[PDB]
């Protein structure tokens, strides 16, 4: 459990499944009037707002990546690289 941050070994990039699930929930939350950490410059589509936050690294989530044994590393979307 809980690999320590200095020992995280998995990829420093965002898998396309992480990117899709992040934008899902983030958009879902916004669509529930969750506060928004970016200036919606006219945008009104929750998915498009989410794509905006993510491009500004302003999504306050974090990815818990389970290893096959059961342990896990934690990356915060702000620190993962997007392509």
């Amino acid at each position: 459990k809980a690999i320590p941050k200095d020992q995280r070994a998995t990829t420093p990039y965002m898998t396309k499944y992480e990117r899709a699930r992040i934008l899902g929930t983030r958009a879902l939350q916004i669509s529930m009037n969750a506060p928004v950490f970016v200036d919606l410059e006219g945008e009104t589509d929750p998915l498009r707002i989410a794509m905006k936050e993510l491009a500004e690294k302003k999504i306050p989530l974090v990815i818990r990546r389970y290893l096959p044994d059961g342990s896990f590393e934690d990356w915060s979307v702000e620190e993962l690289i997007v392509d």
Partner: protein
């Protein structure tokens, strides 16, 4: 003529065994594996034109670094029998001869079969170990075939490491069978892990691991 055949055959089968043991780690001088045919009978066949298996037998010892890898490794006695079937009394001698001189393990070639009497005689004296080899099987060293990749035994230290780098239970590894020919050719025991290194068309070289169930 027929004798000549069973010379060349017995010639080759010999060479295989010398390779097989050399791969198993023991010390075999390089150019002794390649002893040509004529000097073979000029060394091992009687002048009359027959093979004296009963003196072809020999012994060898763990190369100095195998101890550095597997220290518990000990010497090994290789032996051929001559009666095409093998009865207990012949084997009765072997199991004690291995015991008396007390090698780590002993390999028993033979020619035609083993009477199921001595077939039970085998699992007798630990920590020794007894392996039989119908010499038909040995005429070709199968590990030279193309499709067979280099297998490599893993010191129980390496094994303990690899299971940790991947976070594996032993049961989660690819398996091999102790009856598998290559497993036989190195004499694995349950729970031993060989590392297989094959050529890979997508990354050049690739290394896999099977545990000997």
């Amino acid at each position: 003529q027929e004798n000549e055949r069973n010379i060349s055959r017995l010639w080759r089968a010999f060479r295989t065994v010398k390779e097989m043991v050399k791969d198993r780690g023991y010390f075999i001088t390089q150019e002794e594996v390649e002893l040509p045919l004529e000097d073979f009978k000029a060394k091992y066949c009687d002048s009359m034109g027959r093979p004296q298996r009963k003196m072809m037998s020999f012994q060898a010892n763990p190369t100095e670094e195998s101890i550095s890898k597997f220290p518990d490794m000990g010497s090994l006695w290789v032996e051929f029998c001559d009666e095409p079937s093998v009865g207990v009394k012949t084997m009765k001698t072997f199991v004690i001869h291995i015991q008396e001189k007390n090698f780590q393990t002993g390999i028993f070639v033979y020619q035609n079969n083993i009477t199921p009497s001595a077939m039970k005689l085998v699992p007798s004296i630990p920590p020794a170990t007894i392996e039989t080899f119908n010499e038909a099987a040995l005429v070709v060293n199968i590990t030279h075939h193309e499709l067979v990749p280099k297998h490599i035994r893993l010191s129980s230290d390496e094994k303990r490491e690899l299971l940790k780098r991947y976070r594996l239970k032993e049961s989660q590894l690819p398996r091999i069978q102790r009856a598998d020919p290559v497993a036989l050719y190195l004499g694995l025991k349950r729970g031993e892990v060989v590392k297989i290194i094959r050529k890979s068309e997508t990354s050049g070289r690739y290394a896999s691991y099977r545990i000997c169930m």
